[PDB]
UniProtKB/Swiss-Prot annotation:
Biological role stated in the UniProt entry: Involved in reducing some disulfide bonds in a coupled system with glutathione reductase. Does not act as hydrogen donor for ribonucleotide reductase.
Disulfide bond entries: C11-C14
Entry GO terms, CC: cytosol
PROSITE patterns membership: GLUTAREDOXIN_1, GST_NTER
NCBIfam families: GRXB (TIGR02182), PRK10387.1 (NF007702)
Gene Ontology terms for molecular function: glutathione disulfide oxidoreductase activity
Residues of the GST N-terminal domain: 3-79
Family: Belongs to the glutaredoxin family.
Phylogenetic lineage: Bacteria, Pseudomonadati, Pseudomonadota, Gammaproteobacteria, Enterobacterales
Signal sequence range: none
Name under which the protein is recorded: Glutaredoxin 2
Keywords: Disulfide bond, Electron transport, Redox-active center, Transport
Gene this protein is translated from: grxB
Length: 217
């Protein structure tokens, strides 16, 4: 078995794909693409997007949830069998509505391999300042936004059923929630409630995906 996953480290959709390999303890070869590389993904799947899975037969497949469903079913014993929660879905809708106001200007300043060339980092800065707004301005509003995240995490704390699975049994809600919590560890100053923090730490070990406190800004 020699599947390959083409990603950006910061990308939550890439994190979703990475999660299933970790949960199932299936080895996968990670390749971090430079953020300004349109040619590689376009050759693979016809447009610039990540994640992209390369299967054993050398075929490429895009789309994080297609990749998750494919990998989970491969051995005929899916792990993502738990119920999903409408309350978690509502929470993610809300928080994903604004979290990038904190995340994007921080991603832009961080040591992710997709930004290893200064051209790739600049490409990201220019694209995201245009779409999300001026980074210095977003950063100036950090304390307000951090208050919002901390308050939303307080609400989430009551929804974490077990530290190993948000709804008590591994489900697609873990796939949708963890990448956001992982990325939020890049944000210094967040007050993490105990059950959320325990889930975050537990799921990071299950998935073998790194938390980002050492880079937090
Ligand atoms: N539906 C896709 C969305 C993936 C996506 O939007 N990835 C972003 C990075 S976070 C991307 O590739 N954007 C295009 C670009 O970076 O130019 C997923 O489920 O795989």
């Amino acid at each position: 078995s020699a599947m390959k996953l083409y990603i950006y480290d910061h990308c939550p959709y890439c994190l979703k794909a990475r999660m299933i390999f970790g949960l199932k303890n299936i080895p996968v070869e990670l390749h971090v693409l430079l953020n300004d590389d349109a040619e590689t993904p376009t050759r693979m799947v016809g447009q610039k997007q990540v994640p992209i899975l390369q299967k054993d037969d050398s075929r490429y497949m895009p789309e994080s949830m297609d990749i998750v469903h494919y990998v989970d079913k491969l051995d005929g014993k899916p792990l993502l069998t738990g119920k999903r929660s409408p309350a978690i879905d509502e929470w993610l809708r809300k928080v994903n509505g604004y979290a990038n106001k904190l995340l994007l200007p921080r991603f832009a300043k961080s040591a992710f391999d997709e930004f290893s060339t200064p051209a790739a980092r600049k490409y990201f800065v220019d694209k995201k300042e245009a779409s999300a707004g001026n980074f210095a301005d977003l950063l100036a509003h950090s304390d307000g936004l951090i208050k919002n995240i901390s308050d939303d995490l307080r609400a989430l704390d009551k929804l974490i059923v077990k530290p190993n699975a948000v709804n008590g049994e591994l489900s697609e809600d873990d796939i949708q929630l963890f990448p956001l919590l992982r990325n939020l560890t890049l944000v210094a100053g967040i007050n993490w409630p105990s059950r959320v923090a325990d889930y975050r730490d537990n799921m990071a070990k299950q998935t073998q995906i790194n938390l980002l406190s050492s880079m937090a800004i």
